[model samples]
Target: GSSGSSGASVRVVQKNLVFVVGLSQRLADPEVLKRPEYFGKFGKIHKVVINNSTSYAGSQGPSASAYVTYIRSEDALRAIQCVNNVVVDGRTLKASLGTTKYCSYSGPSSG
Candidate 1:
């Protein structure tokens, strides 16, 4: 796959894994932060990024999607196990692994 980085240091752990989570529209309602602690119970969580828009077109706001980076691969697996069907903020959250174009990162431009 040409898309895969050629550097030996850059190990291709999981190219694209999507975890479909059910989050309320008000994702930044403070309660969302607690999920990471629960997520830690499953595995080492490196980072969790919730998407939000900063535009003023009346259509800019936090999305119901997130990108979670785990320190250990097993943690990601455990997260899926413990929180897949769990309810949060009155909504049932789902966790899976796959790639989504919406969050894929392309290399920086030469500009």
Candidate 2:
């Protein structure tokens, strides 16, 4: 006999994850200047993860990515609309859906 509790407790995937592309990180200094701590402007977010220089290691890939998770799926959707084409610190970022669970989102990149 084997005692094991596996393959269980799977909850529905929430569409609360958004990706912010084009976040430039200054390799000149190892710090998070504009690390997306202000994503709360749209609504309350659960957490935000920044893909920083740890991977690039000074390759000068200014196009860093940041993931934002919100309390609710709606917040995530709102964040996308609010962030897309929005300027921050003289930089522009593109917002897109990393995953969807509740709604089907479709729109043109330019309108």
Candidate 3:
């Protein structure tokens, strides 16, 4: 979603949600964020959060991908429909809407 003025007219519209394509590779880091357009041919990103994992046994761990949240839900759904099974950066991304599993909260609980 974008907000701006055209020549001399001001236009403002609230965008609910957007599609966020999570790259299987580490594409949410600082370097990748610098060029999200080149990385993925889609709408602009609201934010890209990378997941860094570590092994419990103190051994080497795997490098996970990231979570991209879009500015509009329709944009996100469209991205999923259009970008699913597509390949980028030598990695195939799995795009989808905000699911319950992914939306689960994990943290210290008062209960």
Candidate 4:
């Protein structure tokens, strides 16, 4: 027989993926910026995909977005916390947990 403690510990793990939007291609191409090399600071990047289709609103044309998958869930959470509201090329970037496994461009406006 075994006795267990009355107290219970709960652990929550976030998804190991982040969806980033509002990346401006005005200053630079989104495809170029969405590379794993750029997002390596957050953690070990498993993969990075950028959507450059004409699907979102932009001053010049269509805006671009990306989905970055990290090897660890903690890294993804950290990236979502740190990357949001950061200005890049004069445009602010937004980040959140991704719903799909792969990158997607169809979603609410990042504006």
Question: Ten consecutive residues with minimal summed lDDT in candidate 4?
Answer: 102-111
Runs off by more than 4 Å, candidate 4 = 1-14, 26-37, 54-60, 101-111
- The 0-to-1 C-alpha lDDT of every candidate, in the order given, reads 0.56, 0.61, 0.52, 0.64
Candidate 1, which segments miss by more than 4 Å at Cα?
A: 1-18, 25-36, 53-63, 101-111
**Candidate 1 residue-wise lDDT, 22-104, digit = tens:** 55556533335436464545544556666545564765443466667776776576667777777866778787775353322
User: How well does candidate 4 score on lDDT at residue 61?
Assistant: 59
Residue 91 error, candidate 4, Å: 0.9
RMSD of 4: 13.6
Q: Mind giving the per-residue lDDT tens digits that candidate 4 earns over 2-110?
A: 5864234333333776777776655334445445555766666766676666555545656667777778888779878988878866778888873454223335323
Which residue segments of model 2 deviate by more than 4 Å?
1-14, 26-37, 55-59, 99-111
lDDT minimum window of 10 residues, candidate 1: 102-111
| Candidate 2 colliding pairs | none
Location of the lowest summed lDDT over 10 successive residues in candidate 3: 99-108
Comparing 2 and 4 on TM-score, the stronger one: 4
* TM-score leader: 4
Q: TM-scores for all candidates?
A: 0.54, 0.57, 0.52, 0.59
Error of 2 at 51 (Å): 1.1
lDDT tens digits by residue: candidate 2, 44-65: 6566566655655665545667
Worst 10 residues of 2 by lDDT: 27-36
Error of 3 at 61 (Å): 6.2
* All-Cα superposition RMSD per candidate: 7.3, 13.9, 13.5, 13.6
lDDT of 4 at 107: 54
